[PDB]
Amino acid sequence: DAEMAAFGEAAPYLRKSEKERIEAQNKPFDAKSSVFVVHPKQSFVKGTIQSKEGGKVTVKTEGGETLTVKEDQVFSMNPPKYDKIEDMAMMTHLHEPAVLYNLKERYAAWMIYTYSGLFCVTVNPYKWLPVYNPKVVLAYRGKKRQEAPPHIFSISDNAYQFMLTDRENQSILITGESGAGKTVNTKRVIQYFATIAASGEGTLEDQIISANPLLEAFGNAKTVRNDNSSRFGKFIRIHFGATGKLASADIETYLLEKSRVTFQLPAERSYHIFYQIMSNKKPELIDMLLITTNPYDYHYVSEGEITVPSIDDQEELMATDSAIDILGFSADEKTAIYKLTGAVMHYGNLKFKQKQREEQAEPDGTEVADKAAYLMGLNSAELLKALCYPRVGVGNEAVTKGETVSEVHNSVGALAKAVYEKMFLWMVIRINQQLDTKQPRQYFIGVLDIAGFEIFDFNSFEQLCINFTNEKLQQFFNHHMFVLEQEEYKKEGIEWEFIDFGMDLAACIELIEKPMGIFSILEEECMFPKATDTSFKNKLYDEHLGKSNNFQKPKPAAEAHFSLVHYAGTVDYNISGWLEKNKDPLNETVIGLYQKSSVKTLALLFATYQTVSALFRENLNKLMANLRSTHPHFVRCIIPNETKTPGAMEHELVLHQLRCNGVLEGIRICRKGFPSRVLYADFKQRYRVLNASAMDSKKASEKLLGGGDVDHTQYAFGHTKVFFKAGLLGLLEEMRDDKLAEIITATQARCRGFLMRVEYRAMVERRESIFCIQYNVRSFMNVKHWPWMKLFFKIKPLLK
Length: 800
What we know:
Elements: H1 11-14, H2 22-25, E1 34-38, E2 44-52, E3 56-59, E4 67-70, E5 74-76, H3 97-105, E6 113-115, E7 120-123, H4 136-139, H5 152-166, E8 170-176, H6 182-196, H7 204-210, H8 212-219, E9 220-221, E10 229-230, E11 233-240, E12 246-248, E13 253-254, H9 272-277, H10 283-289, H11 313-326, H12 331-347, E14 352-354, E15 361-363, H13 368-376, H14 380-388, H15 405-434, E16 443-451, H16 461-492, H17 503-513, H18 518-525, H19 533-544, E17 551-552, E18 562-565, E19 570-573, H20 578-581, H21 588-595, H22 600-605, H23 613-628, E20 631-638, H24 651-661, H25 663-670, E21 677-679, H26 680-687, H27 699-704, E22 715-718, E23 721-724, H28 729-783, H29 787-795
Parallel strand pairs: 7-20, 8-16, 8-20
Antiparallel strand pairs: 1-2, 1-5, 2-3, 3-4, 6-7, 9-10, 11-12, 11-13, 11-16, 14-15, 17-18, 18-19, 21-23, 22-23
């Protein structure tokens, strides 16, 4: 309260009033009966234990329901002292339910930032908050996370701190599902850096920023979950200087959703750019590109939806536009970009027909080709030929091959995608180029934004790539934690031995990335001119099946070819298209043309003209390496309800995320050592009362534990604090709880007593003053009707 001022307005969303707290922590609690429990419809709901079936349990509910569930379908409930704990990992009850429940409660109270160990959980508000408030920014400036409530700037500032304090580089790993809202955070983190440490005495700080809105036009789109979903991953290196002021940046893109460019689900839409451009805010563009304003003229981009109410395509177009400029692009390039982005639309309009009596493809017109050709700095003909009569090079020569209608339509689409991609890559590079300064760099802070392990009934190639990324990231953490943990027990002097927590995952990783592992078998077969998905499949089995544990054959319940056992769970993978997808087949004749375009930029993009998965790995390595020479800082973004409602949460939906997040695994690892750790004074005060009759701030706590019918095992002391297992501290409190009933109940009484004791002193005083009043009135009632008295009355005045 006193403290909070800086935020003031934000306060309510960060922390609660000092009594709201007090009124919550200091309330009645019955441990032995209060509990969390399993629940067929709702995941876990709370209840009170009624009876005990010897290994069955009957419980009442909170809503009113009675269920008899197993002994382990029943989970304890934290004392009220842990209501809306900033750090769930401080709880003495490391369960599945208690975690769900803590998040949930502080959300219904509009607190989106709650920590779970090292993590910084974040829940989508689905509404506006004064949190990103320009006052807060300062507030969180120069503060350890113990000096302030759970928030992202905490993480983000500490990084900075730590950056200069330890002289080590840092990282922030943001991760969550499609609708969790990471970009938002990422961006928000970024601003943070720029603000709190700017040297733009236009400027980096803007380019840095301006970056986003370009990438977003090209790599973002309306997903059925988000309205501005990130369809790619990213890694920025903010290179801080020596002083501590901004010096450079560095972007890198991973796994772009090439498919949007050509397709789109029914409730979704393609990249924004397209819709931006056809919006008509810059009419020249429309004529320049040779298109219309009606998207239904471009199949590639109107398969799903065209307009989104929450987005103003017109405004963005400029945003985008302007960003390009700031970004230092040449008009020409800025022209290539546009012109190139329209060609692609046109391609999807390119039509063909079967040559008569032949199964060959022949152009169905030179209307569109003409445009595509011109826009790319190509020749209509040359183009349509190459497309139709792909001139290959089998043997030591160049053999002209004929294609089918179906083959063309598909190749076209392949270039459309190919071109878009590349371009996107280029833009990034060009950005990076501007973001390159000469000034010295001493450290950087990496901000990684990528997707998290998502499980679908249908898991294809793309899923593997992402999952693999995450399973790595996870191990990355598990280790950092192992390293970290072990320092405490070393600092304190506890005697705890334990194996790296990462190790548990090495099994899965090796199976994927190692030489005779999935990828390899995948990338080898890609070399066999006559291999099949089926072929590949068998190779996969013959070599891993029965011999590898994490390797399994799918359990029918679409289809599946192989399941893997990732940390988050079992993923059923479908291998169909892989071979292809992995080959990135492109009509080289055409590429030829590009290579000699009049449109330099286009020419450039394709000068570098090996498998797909071959890089992904290389890039993913270059990354995980950059991640190592870093002090990892973790941020887990969460999505409350599919339905988009603030203050709400579906259970199992959040539960999911938690497992795949790492949150539930961090709790696990926590609960294996000595979770809760009490600082000695903090230990005295709160528990003295337990055997108060049994000094030093340390030796005391020691001495104290002398009493109690408690496991003298479950704890462990050390130089600054005691270590305790689970549900212990919970046990403590309980005893404590009883001890206050004693203390209070007795203190109440006297009061009560005393209270009335003063009433008697008043009653008594009053004794006569009443009478006086009593009798006095009565007189009058009698008198007022008496002649003599009325007389006296009229007369009483004439007197003196």
